[PDB]
Amino acid sequence: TSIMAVTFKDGVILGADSRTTTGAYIANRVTDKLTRVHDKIWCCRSGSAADTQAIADIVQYHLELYTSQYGTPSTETAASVFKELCYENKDNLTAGIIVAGYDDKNKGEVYTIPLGGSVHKLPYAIAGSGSTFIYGYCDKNFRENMSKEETVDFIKHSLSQAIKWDGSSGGVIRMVVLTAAGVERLIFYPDEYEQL
Amino acid sequence: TSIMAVTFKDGVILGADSRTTTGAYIANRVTDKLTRVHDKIWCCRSGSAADTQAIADIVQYHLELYTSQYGTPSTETAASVFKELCYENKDNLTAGIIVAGYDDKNKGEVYTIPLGGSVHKLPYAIAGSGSTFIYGYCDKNFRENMSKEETVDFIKHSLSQAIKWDGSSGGVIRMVVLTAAGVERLIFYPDEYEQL
Amino acid sequence: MDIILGIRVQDSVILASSKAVTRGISVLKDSDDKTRQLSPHTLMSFAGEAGDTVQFAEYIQANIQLYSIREDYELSPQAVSSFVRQELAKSIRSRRPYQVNVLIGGYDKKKNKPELYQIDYLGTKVELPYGAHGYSGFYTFSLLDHHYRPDMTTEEGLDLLKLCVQELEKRMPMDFKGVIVKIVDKDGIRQVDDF
Amino acid sequence: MDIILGIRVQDSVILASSKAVTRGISVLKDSDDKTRQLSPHTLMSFAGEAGDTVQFAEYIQANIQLYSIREDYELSPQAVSSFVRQELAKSIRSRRPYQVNVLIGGYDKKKNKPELYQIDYLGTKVELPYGAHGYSGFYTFSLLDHHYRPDMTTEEGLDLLKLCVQELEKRMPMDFKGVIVKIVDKDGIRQVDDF
Amino acid sequence: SDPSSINGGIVVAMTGKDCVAIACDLRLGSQSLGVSNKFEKIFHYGHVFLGITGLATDVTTLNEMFRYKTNLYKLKEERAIEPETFTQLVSSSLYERRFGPYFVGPVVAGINSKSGKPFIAGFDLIGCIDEAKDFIVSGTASDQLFGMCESLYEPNLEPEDLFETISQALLNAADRDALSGWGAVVYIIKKDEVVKRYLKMRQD
Amino acid sequence: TTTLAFRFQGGIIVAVDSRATAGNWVASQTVKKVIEINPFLLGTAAGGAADCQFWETWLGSQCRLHELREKERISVAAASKILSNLVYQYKGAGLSMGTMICGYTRKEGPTIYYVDSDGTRLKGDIFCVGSGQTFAYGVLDSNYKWDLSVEDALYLGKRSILAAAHRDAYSGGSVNLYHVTEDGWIYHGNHDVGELFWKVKEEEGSFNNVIG
Amino acid sequence: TTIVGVKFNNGVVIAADTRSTQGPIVADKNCAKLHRISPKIWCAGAGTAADTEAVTQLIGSNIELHSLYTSREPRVVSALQMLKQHLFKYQGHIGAYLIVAGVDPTGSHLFSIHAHGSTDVGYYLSLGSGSLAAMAVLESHWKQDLTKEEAIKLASDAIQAGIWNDLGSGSNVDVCVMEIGKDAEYLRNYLTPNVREEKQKSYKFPRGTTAVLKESIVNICDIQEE
Amino acid sequence: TQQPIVTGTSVISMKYDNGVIIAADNLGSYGSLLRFNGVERLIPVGDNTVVGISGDISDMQHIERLLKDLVTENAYDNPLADAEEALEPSYIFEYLATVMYQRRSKMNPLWNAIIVAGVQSNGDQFLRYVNLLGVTYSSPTLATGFGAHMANPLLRKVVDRESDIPKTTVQVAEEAIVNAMRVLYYRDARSSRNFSLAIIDKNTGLTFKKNLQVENMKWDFAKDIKGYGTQKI
Amino acid sequence: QFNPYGDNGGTILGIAGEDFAVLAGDTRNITDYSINSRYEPKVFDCGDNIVMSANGFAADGDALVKRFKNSVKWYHFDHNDKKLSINSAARNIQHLLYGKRFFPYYVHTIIAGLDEDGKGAVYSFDPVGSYEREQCRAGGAAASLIMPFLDNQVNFKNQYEPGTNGKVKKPLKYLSVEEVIKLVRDSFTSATERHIQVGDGLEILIVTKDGVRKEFYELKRD
């Protein structure tokens, strides 16, 4: 799995591959790992598909109920709910989740939640088995306050390399753009990103 | 351990960190992992320090005896001797070796020998625990027929990132340049390569 | 404990049970009675893990004696054996199961017939003309297959039982210090004091 | 096998060894002689793993008999015991060690003294007034500590030996089917046919 | 150690023309030791027949349990339970012990009293229904029974012919299994008469 | 497996069953568990089929070589010891054997040696070996005498195997009888248990537990 | 086991083989792996047979009660949600691997479910030991905008690939078509490419061939009057 | 006894009317890391045989050296080395099969699965399999690893039995092989897009194709797939 | 850890007639849940009118057959082209198998032919070399399905004569080659239905005084 979230001038973009594997068999080559817990709060999922789906479903429920009572939740609030589930059930869960969202007050924010259940607020975050192969690349190429086009290129190039080297990553590169303008879905096929 | 060898226009350059670890304790912070088996045939060592030293010592002996009888050996010949030891004793060895050398006829050549004992001739090669973090970077930034200065920068930047992310890698960046001109040793200290 | 035998003849049921109690390397006792009277015409012998055997036997004894008082009536051997089986069948899926095997010898006063039931710790019940638990059956069933006859007298049953004990004393490695023999018939339960 | 005893009195050495041979659940034999005559005035009893015991005893027997013929002379019990110990001490660091414990009872014709040696499978030798291997010593040493006196006659030694066997038959779980007793003195080796 | 092969035994069922047949061996043992040669494994509740192989304590327990349940069924419903309905009751009852199961191999056989249609069914230890047209097998010699039934069986056999087929299937399968045999019983079942026959077989 | 052998007035009786199993699966009902080493020696087979077969037919080759070299019939003691010494060399490797070496010679008389894969070698009057040995012992010990007729001794051996065939799940098939005398062994037929059981039950009045 | 699901123009089709196996033995030759959750929501099951049946019955039962409570036809996403949450709770121990398909007022749907509780969406899916043989066929012949006739053909061909090449699958092909605005048609034994040939011999025995000890009439009737 | 380190995935093959086709991708994996992207795993022997190897790469290179050495040895004192006494596919296979079974019998196996594809002197198609256990078998279609599970089903639809071989042309056979390689790229997590293909025909000889790529891939339908069930956006 | 053994499935069957003998075996070869080959010959003509099959782990099976064929060749060289009798071949195979007693050939071996009196003969072996002449034997994966059927239909076990009711057995009348082939085909058809490792094809080798003949029959491919 290769997943990442990157903040930029106008907000935040989430990125992911589409491969799900049972050992070396690709059980699904067109998986959607970018999932929605609120209108402009999404997450990237890595680890167990069952665990991360179960967690994401519970979070979506919690934020839906939060919204009905207290209005739109912050991205920090969403990350805290993810953390509470991941930390308190650390013994029984295998879930590596990146939470990303767009407020108007706080703009683009990214929170990463590794195995332990710890929370880390970062300008950008990478995770999944394939992330190991792009620590060098991402650290050298990331800048703050990039444009939308620059950020798409950064994620596209980064995940392209992660896919190239990691057997557990592959298929299409899905992306989700979160800005004041709204929510935009992007897809990039092998023929496009392999020749980069 | 972070080690790499890169061919370029005038020949080949070997690069390595200087960290040796017993668990999390750094047993030696100024280790020389770039070792000489012949005048212009060197190697990078990763894995067990004892195994790779024992192997390198035996190879140097074999090539010294080869030279006395048949004249200067090729880099391919040196790689074959490494392979023979690593393959036939695969059950008892933990050694990941990169062989690099300069002929006048063949110019710069690089052979990598992973755990199994297989041989792979490549334009450049990376190995050691820290290499995982720079597959993305090295693949994107490597060009054939680079200059000496460009190749030094490529290795310096690459190993800098490998050191940054891998706990088993660190200290100074040692390098060895192999050309027709001769053999040049280079060293780069933390203050220099960390700010890159 | 070790060896417990049972044989049903024409008009009675005979139970034979070893006297030895061994804990490890020493025979702590050589006169132990591995049986409990459940009712005037029903006797139960037992063998298994230390402690569990007596605790289970006395627990069954208490329950049957409670039934007898409540109804002023003695349960049939068949009814008692079924109650015992169910307790063991319940036990086998417990946190800590009763590790006890039993023989139930009784005389049914209604049908005027002796009855012998063999039940293991899993709750496996079978009615038999002759039975045994543990390694005893490995020696004694061949003799009983040959010699047994459904219409033996009680005296003939005791002679056939002596032949079983003699074979056990010859071929078994463990010294079980002889057996206590008890007869169950229409007149109740009695012990053969010389065997 | 199981129980082997030894006692050195005034003018002789008495060895007692069980007759039973058990494989698993059955006593295959009840008249087995767990001893070999090494020389006219030296007897060795043995107990350990099946097969190894006899193979080792006969191997020692052959070597001592070879020595006797070559030199036309009988080795002292002390000399024989040392040879045996070294073979076992050699054996314990072999690919497959001899799993055998022995008692060596002999009469030294030079010193006119009976001698009893106890050696285990590791090659641990000790000279003793009385000895045993396995669980036998756990019962018998307390009796021998009380009763033994070193000036006892052979008849007194046999009585004290009967008291040991009676205690073993009372408290040991395994039926060892009695013992074969052999006496070693100045006149040689003989078997007590009624014990 | 393996609960399904401590006591041993087998059951087989077959369909014929307007009839069904169910048969079992009589052995109960403790591994190698043969204990009982009268341990029948076929029971009946009204006109519905149930055969049970496997751990004997569970064989007894389940018989007592299904007698219990079919008796309450009859009191409330005011009619005898049918094979199709009973099959579902067995499945339900076994699955409620999903993670602590009875170690058994049940087999249902009978004729529907209203439609007259012959019916057989088999189960695994946790409830799965195998509703075969031809035959069902169960026990420690199930492989042997599969081989016999698959070769000997033909459809639409008359009651007296079906008896021979099922009897030969059981006998020859049992004789190739160490933990089966010691006698055998065969039930021939028609819409309103049931014949029970004990078979003479080798007692080893 | 159930095999037995016992000494008596008229020589030795050897009786064995015929069953072979792989787990609960009955592999064979027609196994020859007695081996005709020569016209005077018999060997019984219990445990591993191959081990027993291979090394007992090998034993026959060694016995034949002995009498070629020594111009004399091999003793039962010597023949048994060749086999026991051989298996002792393999001790620990995993051989699985329980055997009786039965014979008669002028110097020894009728002799039986129990030989075993742990290296055990025992001379004796009565032996029963195999998974059903305990069942056979019951019948033998209660009915054995030195003064038995060849006819009565043969039946006792046949009956003791039948007892074990019935109760022991890993014994059965049929009974092979041999009678060893001064003038060699004599085969006394294959007796199917499926027919023998009902015959014995009816005539002897035994097995009243079973219905027939 | 080979089970598949294929989307098409105006609905969805699912299919399955009919072999059940205990180890290397075939327990049932004509097993029914297509289960009805509701009239127009069906699912195919792989893995432990008692589990797929039980978990389908339970959710199917609760779906029926839900449909009566809400006065609405049941939705596939409801069946999906109830199945995944149930399976997740049991941490994979309930060995049910399902392909859930159906039509409802929202449209036509196709999902897969695994024992640990993870769900996946797709136009074509396959599960079981023969899923690799089936998926090979699907990946070679699937296209967008399939007709009903083409989807049935593709689905059954994928099951056949399992039947012939996977030892865990065999016998017959069951199909269930669920088209929008129509009744779901359940095609039991849609294909039968594995009929056994006639035997060489008849093994009917002569009457009296088996030896009998005792005979007796069994009383199946109740206690009688008078 | 060892464990495989650098590994190669599926090798697939089939017979057709005038010869045999074999293929394998150019990847050398190091666990989940797709380490080496230029590894040739089809090794020709003469002009009538191609040996395709999967599994441990260090052992593959050893086997490659044995075959190279076999050709050298066959030429020694052999005037008909390029004619009647040239190396046959059957000879090359039996040699490997001998080595594989000998090595498993010393508990030190060559951790590979091998397919020898070729054409004999009399024009007959040769196609046989051998692996680390020394197990051998022949079939109209043969495949290793994941290919066994995914390629064989597809290739068996073209040639289902022996009588289907004369009815299968080289164009139809190559088409089936190339499709199978695409399917393996979709579904095998240790495969690559780049592969090599070899055809051995009794008329046109040995054709060795390098640097082939999987093309005509279907991915467009991915854009419509959203969430894992209930999600709409 | 490396496991030197594997299981290639399959099933074989030998039946001895009055003046003939047959050795049959399916042609399917498998690992786990995959088919390797639908036609991989398993029963082999080894010369001297002897047929052989070693079922189980195919690598060991091929190795053994190869070594026995070799043994026949050297028997001719060493003993003046003498015909190797079926009983002598059987004893020779015992030694081949027991020679690897502590690292066995993981196979069930069956050979078939004619004895020195011209009568049909079948010998059966376990992996470590124990052997026994038999009238009937099935081996391999579906042996447990086939043997009981052969006890019943070849040796007339548990069969008696009508009217007598268990008193008189069914007489053991001899079976022709046409009658045996019928029983072989039905055995494999039945085994194919209930055993996943059996199918694809059936190859029968018939041995008579005239020589060795072959017959092939299709089996279900699922």
Ligand SMILES: *[B]([O])([O])[C]([C][C]([C])[C])[N]C(=O)[C]([C]C1=[C][C]=[C][C]=[C]1)[N]C(=O)C1=[C]N=[C][C]=N1
């Ligand atoms: B990715 O590879 O981490 C991926 C992310 C997931 C949310 C779709 N995980 C998987 O593919 C996991 C296996 C795994 C691989 C690598 C690291 C951790 C876990 N797969 C599954 O959970 C799975 C596989 N087959 C069926 C169902 N679920």
Ligand SMILES: *[B]([O])([O])[C]([C][C]([C])[C])[N]C(=O)[C]([C]C1=[C][C]=[C][C]=[C]1)[N]C(=O)C1=[C]N=[C][C]=N1
């Ligand atoms: B490097 O980290 O791989 C390094 C290369 C070596 C040639 C100097 N190896 C080590 O530091 C090894 C441990 C190790 C770490 C990571 C991967 C593999 C091995 N250390 C030693 O061999 C060592 C440690 N302490 C004392 C002596 N030797």
Ligand SMILES: *[B]([O])([O])[C]([C][C]([C])[C])[N]C(=O)[C]([C]C1=[C][C]=[C][C]=[C]1)[N]C(=O)C1=[C]N=[C][C]=N1
């Ligand atoms: B007997 O039960 O010991 C018997 C004697 C043997 C010489 C045929 N042994 C076996 O049947 C053994 C299994 C066994 C069962 C019980 C105790 C000890 C051993 N069987 C085999 O050796 C064997 C040989 N070939 C095929 C199948 N089984």
Ligand SMILES: *[B]([O])([O])[C]([C][C]([C])[C])[N]C(=O)[C]([C]C1=[C][C]=[C][C]=[C]1)[N]C(=O)C1=[C]N=[C][C]=N1
């Ligand atoms: B298929 O092969 O996955 C199939 C699908 C099933 C739902 C009909 N599975 C089975 O047939 C399973 C395989 C299995 C074997 C052992 C443990 C778990 C699963 N079989 C059974 O569920 C089964 C086996 N014997 C009797 C009844 N059911």
Ligand SMILES: [Cl-]
């Ligand atoms: Cl997912």
Ligand SMILES: [Cl-]
């Ligand atoms: Cl170093």
Ligand SMILES: [Mg+2]
């Ligand atoms: Mg560092």
Ligand SMILES: [Mg+2]
């Ligand atoms: Mg000591």
Ligand SMILES: [Mg+2]
């Ligand atoms: Mg010897």
Ligand SMILES: [Mg+2]
């Ligand atoms: Mg028996």
Ligand SMILES: [Mg+2]
């Ligand atoms: Mg199939």
